Amino acid sequence: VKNSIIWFRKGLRLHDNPALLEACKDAKHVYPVFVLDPHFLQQKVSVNRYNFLLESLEDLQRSFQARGSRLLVLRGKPEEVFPRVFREWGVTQLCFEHDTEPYAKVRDAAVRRLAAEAGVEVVTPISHTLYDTDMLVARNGGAAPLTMQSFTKLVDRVGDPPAPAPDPPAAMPPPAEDMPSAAPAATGVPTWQEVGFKEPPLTVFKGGETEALARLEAAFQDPKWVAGFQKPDTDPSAWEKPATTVLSPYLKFGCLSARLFHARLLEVYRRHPAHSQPPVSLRGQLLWREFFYTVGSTTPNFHRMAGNPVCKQIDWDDNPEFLAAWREARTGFPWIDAIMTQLVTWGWMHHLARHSVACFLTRGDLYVSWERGMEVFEEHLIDQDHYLNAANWMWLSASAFFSQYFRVYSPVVFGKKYDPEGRFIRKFLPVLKDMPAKYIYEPWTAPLEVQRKAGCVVGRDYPAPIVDHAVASKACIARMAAAYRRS
Ligand SMILES: Cc1cc2nc3c(=O)[nH]c(=O)nc-3n(C[C@H](O)[C@H](O)[C@H](O)COP(=O)(O)OP(=O)(O)OC[C@H]3O[C@@H](n4cnc5c(N)ncnc54)[C@H](O)[C@@H]3O)c2cc1C
Ligand SMILES: [Cl-]
């Protein structure tokens, strides 16, 4: 008889899950498995993202229970848990979604060898990205495209991505009864208190496939908004109703299928002939993700500067004081400190908000290495993605993909074009909620009578700016010039 395991790592969904469909085919018992390292925190992981993962597992648990099954959360390392449950459950097939991250390739190769020793068939479909990224490299002549323009031409020669896979059956083969490793008390979804976190999560975005599909339908409620979507023209100060889809955390964990997203976009584009085109369209945003996944998976040391063949070697400053002020949202620029506060409280900011803080830290003002601001994002972002966090930090720091270092965002003027009253600043920096709009972007310029009346004295209630932007940006720009010619 066929006993199969569907191993969840990413792809935390039932829709468009060809690995799940294969595991259920002709199966007598199916074991939905997620593997959890109970010592992961005793090692840089905010409770916002980890609770988002736990909420996504609870959603999977309810979706399996409704179909006669149960999600098994196994504690331990996969190289140890799988050899045991292979024999205990009589497993004949192991199915999981392909993953191209560096740690995943090392981990999955070992499990494959353990599966071969136990006579277990391994099926690993691709469904996390739009395409087989190795096929894109092969069709381009053996190397990944290094510009978005050549990448868009490549995917148009290849054609449409595969359609989303059918829904799983209404009833699933359950796990076998009375298996010791499947005991309910040892395979349940833990809470954030039980894994060791002391402070609760503060983000407003709930994890899970159900929430992902609900947010997807909300985005497509106005097809003209989807058709005319232009990414650079969206508002980074919009927080009550964010200017973009905020589907990145669901696409990161796989709660939402990228192919389903792409299939719904083409349905709208077929009825709106003047729809936006890449790279600014909504489809172009999925292509940015596909582009960085393709170039990152094929480039050594992609998450670092040294040994990275695509990254420029710039002599960044080792300045712990600047990094600490930026990390702790006390730079003295309310626009910067408000975004960094949104990073810690929500785990998500608009793309152009990430532009503002990443430029300020690196090539714009502080000249701190993009690797340092990266690890800050890796801790707090609920949508943190190994390849997307990397490539965008190299973009913003003019280390790769982007080379126009004379374009420096002003930490004072940028947000004022969108939000002159500073509604975004007052929401995330309530210490400035009474400051008049004339000074809310430059509170050090307000007269003291205004600072006292507003209850926000610069240097006592809110810090003075750590740098002069005109002096700092002039120095950084000229140094980047010395870095770029000496290359
Ligand atoms: C310094 C920096 C770090 C970033 N780190 C991450 C990260 O860790 N995870 C992450 O998902 N995105 C990252 N991005 C990209 C981008 O800012 C987010 O994807 C975007 O803010 C998500 O909002 P949204 O889901 O509403 O996007 P939408 O505009 O609605 O786009 C839809 C989807 O397209 C993809 N997408 C959009 N913009 C990009 C982009 N520039 N690169 C790659 N894919 C994109 C995402 O999957 C997103 O969910 C980073 C950008 C910067 C500048
Ligand atoms: Cl600007």
Side-chain angles (χ1 to χ4, degrees), residues 1-43 45-484 487:
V1 317
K2 175 180 176 180
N3 296 317
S4 57
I5 297 177
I6 167 63
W7 178 17
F8 287 94
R9 304 95 62 84
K10 302 181 182 180
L12 307 177
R13 61 184 190 266
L14 269 62
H15 75 270
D16 188 21
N17 198 333
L20 179 60
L21 300 177
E22 174 66 32
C24 296
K25 188 230 306 254
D26 298 328
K28 184 65 163 176
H29 301 102
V30 178
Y31 295 84
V33 166
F34 186 94
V35 185
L36 187 110
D37 194 46
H39 305 301
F40 208 161
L41 309 187
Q42 297 177 333
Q43 281 187 353
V45 184
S46 66
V47 68
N48 276 334
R49 176 165 81 257
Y50 205 93
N51 181 72
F52 192 97
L53 167 68
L54 296 177
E55 287 172 341
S56 302
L57 298 181
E58 288 188 346
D59 190 65
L60 283 180
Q61 183 69 277
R62 299 190 295 267
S63 299
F64 280 122
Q65 284 180 344
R67 287 175 163 83
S69 186
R70 178 169 58 105
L71 176 64
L72 308 181
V73 179
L74 305 178
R75 274 76 168 172
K77 294 127 227 186
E79 298 83 2
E80 284 146 31
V81 172
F82 278 135
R84 179 224 308 165
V85 301
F86 283 164
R87 281 83 176 173
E88 174 186 320
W89 300 344
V91 181
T92 62
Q93 190 185 63
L94 171 59
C95 303
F96 53 87
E97 190 176 67
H98 184 52
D99 190 358
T100 60
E101 292 190 9
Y103 170 72
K105 292 188 291 241
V106 173
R107 169 200 64 195
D108 294 345
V111 181
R112 293 168 193 268
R113 297 181 178 180
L114 295 168
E117 289 185 359
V120 177
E121 178 195 14
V122 178
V123 188
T124 61
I126 296 161
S127 49
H128 182 63
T129 55
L130 293 173
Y131 302 91
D132 186 336
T133 51
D134 288 329
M135 173 270 293
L136 296 178
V137 175
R139 282 179 119 109
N140 199 38
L146 287 157
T147 71
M148 177 68 163
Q149 211 230 41
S150 62
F151 182 83
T152 302
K153 302 164 80 207
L154 171 65
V155 302
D156 287 333
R157 286 192 258 103
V158 175
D160 289 352
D167 287 327
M172 288 185 177
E177 308 267 20
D178 304 328
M179 292 295 184
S181 293
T187 56
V189 180
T191 62
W192 59 264
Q193 296 100 322
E194 296 178 331
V195 297
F197 290 107
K198 312 194 193 298
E199 282 169 334
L202 299 179
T203 185
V204 299
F205 304 109
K206 302 293 192 59
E209 171 187 13
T210 306
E211 292 287 339
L213 294 177
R215 191 160 204 97
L216 176 69
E217 298 292 344
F220 282 75
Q221 204 72 14
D222 182 11
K224 307 199 212 97
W225 180 87
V226 171
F229 184 88
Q230 296 196 58
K231 181 60 164 288
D233 299 337
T234 54
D235 186 0
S237 70
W239 61 270
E240 304 182 29
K241 203 276 138 39
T244 56
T245 65
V246 200
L247 289 172
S248 52
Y250 307 97
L251 291 164
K252 172 263 190 313
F253 283 108
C255 306
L256 177 64
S257 166
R259 292 174 179 176
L260 174 61
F261 195 178
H262 194 278
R264 295 285 297 270
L265 288 169
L266 297 185
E267 294 179 4
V268 174
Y269 292 168
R270 286 174 184 178
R271 309 233 297 181
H272 298 80
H275 67 84
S276 48
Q277 294 290 344
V280 305
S281 66
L282 251 193
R283 170 171 179 264
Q285 302 314 297
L286 291 179
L287 294 182
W288 281 114
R289 178 182 181 267
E290 197 83 1
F291 169 61
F292 293 148
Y293 261 83
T294 302
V295 66
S297 54
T298 54
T299 300
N301 303 314
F302 188 76
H303 48 300
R304 27 260 320 269
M305 183 188 74
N308 193 342
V310 311
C311 183
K312 198 121 331 179
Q313 311 303 313
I314 303 164
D315 211 53
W316 308 101
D317 296 348
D318 191 355
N319 200 137
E321 304 87 21
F322 279 175
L323 173 63
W326 181 87
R327 181 181 63 247
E328 300 171 6
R330 50 181 187 85
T331 64
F333 296 88
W335 176 249
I336 300 300
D337 297 337
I339 298 173
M340 297 304 290
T341 298
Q342 190 186 29
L343 169 66
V344 175
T345 59
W346 283 19
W348 183 98
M349 324 87 85
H350 183 272
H351 181 60
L352 288 181
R354 312 189 191 192
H355 267 236
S356 292
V357 293
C359 180
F360 183 87
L361 177 75
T362 56
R363 64 176 181 88
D365 291 82
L366 305 188
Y367 218 76
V368 180
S369 175
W370 59 270
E371 300 190 56
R372 306 283 80 81
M374 202 176 63
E375 17 194 275
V376 179
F377 275 27
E378 315 243 300
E379 179 179 351
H380 297 282
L381 279 179
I382 62 179
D383 64 6
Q384 76 90 15
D385 190 293
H386 187 93
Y387 288 135
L388 307 186
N389 219 257
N392 281 274
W393 270 103
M394 285 182 288
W395 185 294
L396 258 295
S397 67
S399 300
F401 310 114
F402 179 87
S403 67
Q404 185 50 265
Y405 53 86
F406 289 106
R407 177 69 182 102
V408 172
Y409 305 116
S410 175
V412 165
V413 181
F414 188 82
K416 205 194 300 208
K417 78 193 43 257
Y418 302 100
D419 186 6
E421 356 210 350
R423 298 206 185 281
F424 180 84
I425 295 176
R426 302 171 198 271
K427 160 67 180 181
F428 294 100
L429 295 180
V431 68
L432 287 158
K433 68 183 170 64
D434 292 332
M435 184 68 66
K438 194 167 197 166
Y439 312 107
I440 193 172
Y441 287 89
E442 295 164 302
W444 62 92
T445 61
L448 201 20
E449 185 102 64
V450 175
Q451 300 182 20
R452 296 210 175 111
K453 207 213 110 171
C456 181
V457 177
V458 178
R460 166 173 84 83
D461 302 309
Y462 183 78
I466 59 178
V467 295
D468 187 317
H469 177 63
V471 181
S473 65
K474 227 264 218 65
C476 292
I477 277 180
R479 291 219 278 154
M480 293 288 301
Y484 251 93
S487 101

